[PDB]
Amino acid sequence: GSSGSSGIKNFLYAWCGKRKMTPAYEIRAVGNKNRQKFMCEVRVEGFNYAGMGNSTNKKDAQSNAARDFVNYLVRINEVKSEEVPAVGIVPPPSGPSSG
């Protein structure tokens, strides 16, 4: 390995890789005809909670899903924020109690 870790995805994969685990991402189709959406849900054996991600784009939806699960881990005391990457990006608020 000759690269660094700059992202939310590489974080989960890195934390899971060591724990001999692999997250499963699944994209779904929802919304209306005019405005379509792609809901992504990530599940990890052993845990009940599942990272939820919403975004018109698949690439984003995936990234979101992870970030979600990450937060849950910290709460359950599974992962320390010290490992979690800083918050630099600032997405739109568009999302009433969604994510």
Side-chain angles (χ1 to χ4, degrees):
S2 196
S3 48
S5 180
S6 307
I8 187 60
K9 166 75 168 208
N10 198 342
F11 167 99
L12 180 53
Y13 191 77
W15 182 90
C16 88
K18 90 180 273 168
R19 299 204 89 64
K20 282 196 281 274
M21 274 190 291
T22 303
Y25 293 67
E26 179 209 48
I27 301 157
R28 271 201 299 191
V30 296
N32 289 21
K33 294 285 162 284
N34 321 327
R35 269 281 195 280
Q36 198 160 53
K37 210 76 171 283
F38 290 135
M39 290 185 159
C40 172
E41 302 185 273
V42 61
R43 290 175 78 275
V44 182
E45 188 210 275
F47 307 110
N48 188 300
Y49 191 69
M52 63 194 279
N54 48 11
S55 279
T56 306
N57 315 308
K58 286 172 207 208
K59 56 206 280 199
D60 270 319
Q62 289 272 341
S63 289
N64 270 351
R67 209 307 204 72
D68 192 71
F69 187 76
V70 180
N71 295 13
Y72 163 67
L73 286 164
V74 176
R75 282 289 289 89
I76 55 182
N77 323 286
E78 270 49 315
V79 178
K80 286 206 168 59
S81 60
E82 73 171 42
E83 312 209 289
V84 177
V87 28
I89 75 301
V90 177
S94 195
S97 277
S98 62

